[PDB]
Amino acid sequence: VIILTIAGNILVIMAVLQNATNYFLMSLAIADMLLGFLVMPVSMLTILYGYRWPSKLCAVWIYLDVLFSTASIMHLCAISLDRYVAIQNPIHHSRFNSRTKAFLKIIAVWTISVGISMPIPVFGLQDDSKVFKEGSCLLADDNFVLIGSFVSFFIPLTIMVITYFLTIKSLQISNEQKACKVLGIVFFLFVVMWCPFFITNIMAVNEDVIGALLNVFVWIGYLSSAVNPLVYTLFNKTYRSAFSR
Ligand SMILES: CCN(CC)C(=O)[C@@H]1C=C2c3cccc4[nH]cc(c34)C[C@H]2N(C)C1
Numbered sequence: 001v002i003i004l005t006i007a008g009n010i011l012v013i014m015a016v017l018q019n020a021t022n023y024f025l026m027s028l029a030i031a032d033m034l035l036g037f038l039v040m041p042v043s044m045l046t047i048l049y050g051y052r053w054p055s056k057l058c059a060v061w062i063y064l065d066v067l068f069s070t071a072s073i074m075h076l077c078a079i080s081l082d083r084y085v086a087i088q089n090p091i092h093h094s095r096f097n098s099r100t101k102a103f104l105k106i107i108a109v110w111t112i113s114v115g116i117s118m119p120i121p122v123f124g125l126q127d128d129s130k131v132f133k134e135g136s137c138l139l140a141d142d143n144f145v146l147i148g149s150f151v152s153f154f155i156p157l158t159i160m161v162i163t164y165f166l167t168i169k170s171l172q173i174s175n176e177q178k179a180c181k182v183l184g185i186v187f188f189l190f191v192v193m194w195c196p197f198f199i200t201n202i203m204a205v206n207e208d209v210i211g212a213l214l215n216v217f218v219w220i221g222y223l224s225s226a227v228n229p230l231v232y233t234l235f236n237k238t239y240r241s242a243f244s245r
Contacts, residue, residue, distance in 0.1 A: 001219065002044065005036030005226040012229045015242040020102040021082070025232055027106045028075040031113075032225035035068035040222050051136045056125075058137040063120040066139075070152045071113035072225060076190055077156040078109050079232070083183075084167045116152055119144060142205050153198045160187065186231055193224035 012029045016022055042061055046053065082105070086093050124131030124141065131141050139145060164187045171180050197217040204210050233239045 001223050001226055002036055002040050005040065005222070006033060008226050008229040009033035009036065011243055012233055012239075015233075015239060017236075017238055017242070020097060020099045024075070024079065024082075024102055024105060027109070028072065028079070028232070029229055031068050031071040031075060032228055034064075035072065035222070035225050039065045039068060040225075043218070043222075046137070053133060053135075053137040058133055059121055059125045059131055061137070062131060062139055063117055066117040066120060066148075066152075067113055069221070070116050071110060072228065073153060073156050073194065074109045074112055076186075076228070077159055078105055080160050080163045080167075080187075084163045084170075087167055087179075088170050116148060119148070145205065146202060149198060149201060153194065157191075157195070160190070182235055189224065189227060189231060193227070194221050197221045 009029045009032050013026060013033070016026045039061065120131050129140065131139055131144070134140055141148075164183060167183060168180055171183075197214070197220065200210065200213050200217055204214070234243070
């Protein structure tokens with residue numbers, strides 16, 4: 001999954017197709033390539049050593065994990081919200097797009113990503129038990145998980161549910177039907193690969209059963225960083241040719 005993530009994103013970074021909307025997909029592919037080289041391979045060492053953490057970098061590793069995970073989720077939310085306005089009223093969307101929105105959009109999805117994960121090393125790096133190890137380097141803040149995973153997933157999820165319901169409502173002519181199938185695959189994969197981890201994360205707060213469930217579901221969430229390059233790009237004839245060359 002690590003090799004797949006890195007090899008999938010470094011093939012999308014070169015291919016950039018210099019559109020104002022395609023550059024935003026490079027900012028999404030940069031939030032996942034970093035996730036695939038800094039955060040993800042560290043967890044492979046933890047899997048090898050059986051949850052024992054080789055010590056002051058544990059709070060740093062969680063900071064990057066929350067940062068790149070929230071940066072990815074709101075990249076897809078911004079894409080989904082932008083894709084709805086481009087489909088509802090395309091005339092008024094083209095007038096107000098001067099290649100400054102795309103730079104203003106990268107600012108917004110990285111200000112909230114870095115603003116939500118800022119409590120981790122500013123209050124939690126001094127305390128070695130709040131955002132810190134139970135012997136295993138977990139995120140033991142029981143009140144930040146409830147509200148920090150609420151605005152990071154469930155608010156981007158209720159935004160995506162209304163955006164997806166409204167977009168399909170406004171898309172209903174084969175090209176419109178081909179697009180409706182692309183939205184379904186994109187929406188279904190984001191839910192099925194991130195939602196399983198977040199219900200288990202918050203329902204938890206038998207330990208052995210839940211400890212095994214959260215272990216596998218974490219890697220299902222990581223695996224979505226290998227797929228995001230493909231489902232958001234490879235539907236384009238140009239990208240398929242670019243990957244082959
Ligand atoms: C096994 C230990 N690890 C790995 C460092 C975690 O618990 C990570 C903690 C996360 C987490 C907590 C709280 C809020 C959040 N938003 C987004 C994420 C998040 C990402 C999420 N990653 C995928 C797992």
